[PDB]
Design a protein around this ligand. Structure first.
Ligand code: 85E
Ligand code: MTA
Lengths: 625, 302
């Protein structure tokens, strides 16, 4: 199921054209709303008085059809940045005219070209239109991977084509897009229709569009090959690009005329369907994570807040995770109790933050498989989850499990633990205050006792994503700092983004913390080599944790525990995008800060330019103790 | 009201060309309203044009007529809104215009078309930025050239050199083509060029107009600000020492002499002037057509 549209520049009759397009299998049709050669004059008599009608009637389609089937196209003669003043004026008037007709019709999107470097005045007219009534309509900027000037045949005897590599030059059209959207102040209504040519540029040129709001990909029929049987197909490289674009669920647009005239015209489209059907389905994870892509979430604070029933349900729907815990507990029981002692030596296990019970059951299954004896305490401060636990205890666990409704930092334990087990980690490892909670529980761990997890490490990586930057930006709220949304992290299944350098470790914590002077504050400086031209928008955060020995949990991409669903990445934004050139280093600084009531992070970029210090004094974001 | 001839001709007249005997060919587009189509018309009496009931022949096309040109005495070569180049032909009786071939080789509107010296090949330019060379008898593209980087505004075949033609484009290039050369295009040394006319009596001399109203005379430079808007077309007259007709979106026609000085001006038109064609029979009569649906017959003082 690819969603696809036909691009035409010639529509003799709307009804007949729409029918033909639908019968061929397309979902929509990009077409002119005025005749593309019907140049109009607004200033000079006599032509300005040309009798109407100026175009085709809105009565030719139903409102539903204008609203869902039609994408409008700016006439090709409209040149708001022409060097001829008169042409700039007529063009502005004509641009407003066609855009207003599109809004008049309720069209769901409108196509405008970026076919040259200077589109200042076009951006100004579009921005003016956008601030003329609040509307949901989208503007698709039609921009090529490769500028026409850079793909022309080498047939001009006295102007040869460049044959030397121009690294930044081959990215010029990304610059056209970036300047245009900067001028238009990152309007959410402005997206990319990326046009693909017969020859693809270097990978770095393609990767420049990573993290950009690509809504559509335009495939001219001329880029298709012909297989033995005569049917249009794509080169393996183009197929690679299509697959990458299907992962962004863009809409595909077929432009140009039918050049495989032996075959009919749904053929180009059937090939796309064929590619879509050929790729690996949802591998458990991606099945689960597709709905969450780039969806910003407040990070849970299970200490300060009492988690809802269904939130625990999400935790519990990850068997790979708990069986990692089971294996960690198992190995530990064996290391601690020799075989000769298997009937005399009962180990005291405390689950610290037991929620609805999954670690309790993992502990019990671990002891069985280890053939060792354990006495269990299930500690949980959330009294609503304590209800689930005490029904479990009465119905199933029996006296082997003691449920303790208490904060682990205040509970006066009646004995000491051989093993404390806990799941206090966030997506940034320590951002739920797992260190503070385990510190306060430590006094009741035996002198030789084991904490599972034994340690964890957060990781950071700079990223580019104009899409995510705009999503954060849109999180302004009525009665707070108008910039506070940039001074707080988000849990998000990062999807439309470009990772700019390999993740590097940030903060690490070990338990038990034998050290006589415990300080959980932290100050870390990271240097990220960046080998691309790009724009920095924030830092992705992940974590790894050692449960026991070689049994680990990880959401860091290069060591992601395979098959584990729990924990999306976290995102630290920065207020202002920072331009980064190939070969530069991104230097970021992260602090973990605390007082007796709250812990928080602050962060700052210091190379290649400085940002502001983000979240000073926790003013935008704190984690409650 | 001859057979298979539409009762009504479309408003926007795009092309007017006399043939040898003086029958007038018309091309029209409907550029607004419900149906965006086109039509082709022959008036053996040009003073009856554009009245449909008194035409010699006519026919509807599927899309609009962006450009056309005679092929010989009975052939009509059409640049279509649909990306097609079409060849139509008059019957032996010259009472029906019949489609000969319609090939969809361009990927956007075909904007300009020009028959080369021999009469057996034509060149077309399009908004798809390509120029194609056609073998009219085999109904096939012989070469496709992507020399330009923006829409191809005009192509003009050399008057006597079958491998030579000009083109200009919104990429601000004027290209001289000679397909005898390995790299066939050459860049001839502003405001965007919009129209081209070879000199009929001097091999290596041409005139071109620009989007700012200027006309220029060029050898393989002389210029005048003739128009207040885009120069849409340039047509040398048939005289031994030719006059130069120029037309513009400013709705005027000018007639210029050897040094680009103005000898005549007409403002008869009330909308864009789209073509001009000189009578073979009466060399001082010059016929224009425009989007105001007028066919005007100017008598140019000589
Ligand atoms: C927003 N957030 N912050 C933190 C977490 C989260 C997720 C899984 C887990 C988990 O196993 N175990 N433990 C913890 C916290 N100690 C945890 C926390 C979530 C969260 C959540 F509360 C609900 C979700 C629902 C559908 C998909 C994803 C999530 C995610 C995610 N990531
Ligand atoms: C699996 S999410 C962390 C779980 O441990 C609980 N928890 C977090 N901190 C503490 C604490 N200091 N004492 C007891 N339970 C806690 C939370 O309420 C949640 O159920």
């Amino acid at each position: 199921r690819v969603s696809s549209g036909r691009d035409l520049n010639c529509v003799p009759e709307i009804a007949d054209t729409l029918g033909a397009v639908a019968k061929q299998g397309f979902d929509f049709l990009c077409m002119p709303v005025f005749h593309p050669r019907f140049k109009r004059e607004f200033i000079q008599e006599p032509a300005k008085n040309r009798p109407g009608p100026q175009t085709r009637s809105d009565l030719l389609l139903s409102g539903r059809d204008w609203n869902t089937l039609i994408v409008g196209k700016l006439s090709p003669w409209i040149r708001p940045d022409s060097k001829v003043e008169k042409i700039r004026r007529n063009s502005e008037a004509a641009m407003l005219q066609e855009l207003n007709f599109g809004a008049y019709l309720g069209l769901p999107a409108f196509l405008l070209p970026l076919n040259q470097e200077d589109n200042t005045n076009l951006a100004r007219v579009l921005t003016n239109h956008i601030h003329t009534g609040h509307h949901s309509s989208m503007f698709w900027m039609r921009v090529p991977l490769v500028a026409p000037e850079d793909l022309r045949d080498d047939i001009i005897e006295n102007a040869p084509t460049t044959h030397t590599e121009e690294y930044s030059g081959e990215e010029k059209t990304w610059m056209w897009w970036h300047n245009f959207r900067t001028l238009c102040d990152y309007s959410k209504r402005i997206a990319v229709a990326l046009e693909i040519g017969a020859d693809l540029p270097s990978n770095h040129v393609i990767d420049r569009w990573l993290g950009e709001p690509i809504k559509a990909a335009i495939l001219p029929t001329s880029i298709f090959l012909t297989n033995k049987k005569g049917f249009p197909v794509l080169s393996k490289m183009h197929q690679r690009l299509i697959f990458r674009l299907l992962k962004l669920e863009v809409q595909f647009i077929i432009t140009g005329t039918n050049h495989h005239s032996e075959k009919e015209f749904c053929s180009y489209l059937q090939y796309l369907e064929y590619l879509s059907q050929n790729r690996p389905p949802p591998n458990a994870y991606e099945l689960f994570a597709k709905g969450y892509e780039d969806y910003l979430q407040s990070p849970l604070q299970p200490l300060m807040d009492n988690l809802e029933s269904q939130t625990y349900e999400v935790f519990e729907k990850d068997p790979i995770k708990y069986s990692q815990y089971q294996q960690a507990i198992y190995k530990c029981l064996l290391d601690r109790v020799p075989e000769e002692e298997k009937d005399t030596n009962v180990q005291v296990l405390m689950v610290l933050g037991a929620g609805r019970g999954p670690l309790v059951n993992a502990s019990l299954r671990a002891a069985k498989q280890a053939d060792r004896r354990i006495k269990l305490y299930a500690v949980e401060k959330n009294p609503n989850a304590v209800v689930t636990l005490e029904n479990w205890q009465f119905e199933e666990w029996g006296s082997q499990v003691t449920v303790v409704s208490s904060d682990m930092r205040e509970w006066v334990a009646p004995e000491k633990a051989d093993i404390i087990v806990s799941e206090l980690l966030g997506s940034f490892a320590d951002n739920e205050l797992s260190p503070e909670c385990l510190d306060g529980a430590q006094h009741f761990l035996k002198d030789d006792g084991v904490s599972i997890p034994g340690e964890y490490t957060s990781f950071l990586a700079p990223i580019s994503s104009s899409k995510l930057y705009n999503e954060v930006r849109a999180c302004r709220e009525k009665d707070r700092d108008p910039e506070a949304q940039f001074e707080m992290p988000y849990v998000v299944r990062l999807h439309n983004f470009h990772q700019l350098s390999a993740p590097q470790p940030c903060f690490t914590f070990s338990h038990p913390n034998r050290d006589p002077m415990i300080d959980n504050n932290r100050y870390c400086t990271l240097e990220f080599p960046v080998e691309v031209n790009t724009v920095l928008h924030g830092f992705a955060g992940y974590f790894e944790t050692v449960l026991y020995q070689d049994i680990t949990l990880s959401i860091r991409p290069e060591t992601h525990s395979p098959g584990m669903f729990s924990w999306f990445p976290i995102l630290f934004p920065i207020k202002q995008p920072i331009t980064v050139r190939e070969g530069q280093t991104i230097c970021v600084r992260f602090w973990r800060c605390s007082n007796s009531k709250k812990v928080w992070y602050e962060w700052a970029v210091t190379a290649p330019v400085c940002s502001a210090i983000h979240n000073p004094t926790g003013r935008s974001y704190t984690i409650g103790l | 009201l001859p057979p298979n001839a539409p009762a009504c001709m479309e408003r926007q007249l795009e092309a007017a060309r006399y043939r040898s005997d003086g029958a007038l060919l018309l091309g029209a587009s409907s550029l607004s309203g419900r149906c965006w189509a086109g039509s082709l018309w022959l008036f053996k009496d040009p003073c009856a044009a554009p009245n449909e009931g008194f035409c010699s022949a006519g026919v509807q096309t599927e899309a609009g007529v962006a450009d056309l040109t005679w092929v010989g005495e009975r052939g009509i070569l059409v640049a279509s809104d649909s990306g097609a180049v079409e060849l139509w032909e008059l019957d032996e009786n010259e009472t029906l215009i019949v489609s000969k071939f319609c090939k969809y080789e361009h990927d956007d509107i075909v904007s300009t078309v020009s028959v080369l010296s021999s009469g057996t090949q034509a060149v077309s330019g399009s908004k798809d930025i390509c120029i194609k060379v056609w073998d009219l008898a085999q109904q096939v593209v012989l070469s496709s050239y992507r020399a330009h980087a923006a829409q191809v505004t005009c192509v003009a075949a050399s008057p006597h050199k079958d491998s030579v033609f000009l083109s200009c484009s919104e990429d601000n290039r004027i290209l001289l083509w000679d397909t005898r050369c390995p790299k066939p295009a050459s860049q001839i040394g502003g405001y965007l060029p919009t129209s081209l006319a070879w000199h009929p009596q001097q091999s290596e001399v041409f005139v071109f107009g620009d989007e700012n109203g200027t006309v220029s005379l060029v050898d393989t430079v002389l210029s005048s600000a003739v128009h207040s808007q885009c120069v849409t077309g340039l047509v040398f007259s048939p005289h031994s020492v030719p006059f130069l007709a120029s037309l513009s979106e400013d709705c005027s026609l000018a007639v210029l002499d050897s040094s680009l000085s103005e000898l005549f001006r007409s403002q008869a038109h009330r909308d864009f002037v789209r073509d001009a064609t000189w009578s073979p029979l009466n060399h001082s009569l010059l016929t224009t057509v425009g989007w105001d649906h007028q066919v005007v017959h100017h008598v140019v003082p000589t």
